[PDB]
């Protein structure tokens, strides 16, 4: 569809500027997404990343796609690795330090998306991010506040302060080591991150910090294309994340149940008490199912069809109490007889 231009909604001004520059010169949405994701790995390091993972939903040439570049547990991970001699969760062991990390997927994900749909040269799409790493970006006030929260959590148990200590609100923050890493990725793609110099540095940090990630974990990492979750209502088609996201199943249930209960929503104003109560009653059932059934779909037989069947959605919608809070103890996973 020839639209009146392209568009970007980005979480900061730098991702927006880069995406727009890519589109303006004739890159496609995937080219722009690659450049933007690497840019935010520099400018929005609280969340944009090359050391994490994520999901991409795409609509290309009228066809829906989904790319899963979620991290995987290291091969040396074990069910009780975060429990102590009492069998209790060790405070912050799954949140702070090297044993908290899954195998990163982002570089592989962006590569796979670009290989399949990109129009512009990979190395050129990294140049904006390299520039922001070399010559800097302006730290935001909210970003600094998140930094302070993280410093409180890390409490001197990691090397965070040695690299992000100079992040100060309103001031330009440069990242020369990351710039060199992005240059290697520009030249070698995932080969640098999973098999090359960056891999070696990651492994060395694991050795230094007692982590679990090994060269085997990195060379075995694969992003996965999956069929997106499809939800139809009122003539619209929503494509969203399937498992290992819980959001697709949740949205299928939230939308389906709300539609089933249209008579109870009729005339109810947005964010009135009744409206919020109704959403909460729906959310009770969604989270009951999420906790009991959902996980990586290749590691158990997850009953996706049963949990999204229209007859099941109708049954769960029947549980919603429009006038009072349902007893929490009586909210059960919906397939339990």
């Amino acid at each position: 569809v020839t639209l009146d231009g392209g568009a970007v909604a980005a979480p900061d001004q730098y991702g927006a500027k880069v995406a727009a520059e890519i589109l303006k010169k004739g890159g496609n949405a995937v080219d722009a997404a690659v450049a933007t994701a690497f840019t935010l790995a520099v400018t929005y390091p609280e969340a944009g990343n090359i050391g994490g993972g994520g999901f991409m939903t795409l609509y290309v040439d009228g066809k829906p796609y989904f790319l899963d570049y979620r991290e995987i547990a290291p091969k040396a991970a074990t069910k009780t690795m975060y429990l102590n001699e009492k069998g209790e969760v060790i405070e912050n062991l799954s949140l702070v330090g090297a044993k908290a990390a899954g195998v990163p997927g982002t570089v592989m994900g962006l590569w796979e998306a670009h290989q399949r749909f990109g129009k512009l040269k990979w190395s050129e799409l990294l140049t904006p991010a390299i520039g922001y790493a070399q010559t800097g970006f302006k730290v935001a006030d909210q970003q600094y506040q998140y930094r302070q929260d993280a410093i409180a959590l890390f409490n001197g148990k990691t090397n965070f302060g040695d690299y992000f200590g100079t992040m100060k609100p309103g001031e330009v923050f440069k990242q020369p080591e990351l710039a060199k890493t992005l240059e290697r990725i520009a030249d070698k793609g995932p080969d640098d991150f999973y098999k090359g110099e960056t891999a070696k540095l990651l492994i060395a940090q694991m050795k230094q910090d007692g982590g679990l990630i090994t060269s085997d974990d990195l060379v075995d990492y694969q992003a996965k294309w999956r069929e997106p979750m499809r939800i139809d209502w009122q003539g619209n088609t929503l494509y969203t994340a399937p498992l290992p996201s819980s959001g697709g199943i949740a949205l299928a249930q939230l939308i389906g149940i709300k539609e089933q209960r249209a008579a109870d929503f009729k005339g109810v104003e947005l964010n009135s008490a009744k409206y919020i109560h109704l959403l909460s009653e729906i959310e009770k059932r969604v989270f009951a199912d999420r906790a009991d059934y959902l996980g990586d779909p290749q590691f158990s037989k997850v009953p996706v069809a049963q949990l999204t069947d229209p007859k099941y959605i109708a049954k769960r919608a029947g549980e919603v109490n429009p006038d009072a809070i349902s007893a929490t103890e009586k909210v059960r996973p919906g397939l339990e007889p």
Binding site: V8, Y44, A47, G54, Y146, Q205, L254, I255
Partner: protein, 193 residues
Amino acid sequence: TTHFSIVDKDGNAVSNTYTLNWDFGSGVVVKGAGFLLNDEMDDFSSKPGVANAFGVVGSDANAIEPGKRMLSSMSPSIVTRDGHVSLVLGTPGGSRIFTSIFQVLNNVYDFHLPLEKAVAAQRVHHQLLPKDTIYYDAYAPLTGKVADELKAMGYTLEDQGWNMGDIQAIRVNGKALETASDPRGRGVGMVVK
């Protein structure tokens, strides 16, 4: 987590949500390379029935296993109508992500709000456990008659201490495009024409 949304002039769309999990992840920087490592392992169930950092629980399906992906709430989304993109959206917010997307969809499709109002509107969250607890943010806290009635029904209202998402959205109406960046964050949107 953060999210971005892109549409090109050919009607192709990308909705991308990605993350380190908590802000700045595990706090471990790869010496010599300069990037942070995630703390995504906390999204597994560490012990059946024990809540993680977002208050969510699990058992066997989301237990730790080598090579396994940990359950997520990230929900990058694209709405279409008649084979053409109509809305691209997503957000951070851990276990609030899909409830925030649901609220924005309700605001656009049921209340027929302009995109900017649909994104700026107050959002709240409930998730079964903690019991009867509704979370709100300081951007649009629950107050006044709505808060009082909810408390009268028996709800506990809690300021969660972080904004309730950061929606980044693009809407398409025929050939025309509009962007919305959540006022909870520092996002920017541009139509490129």
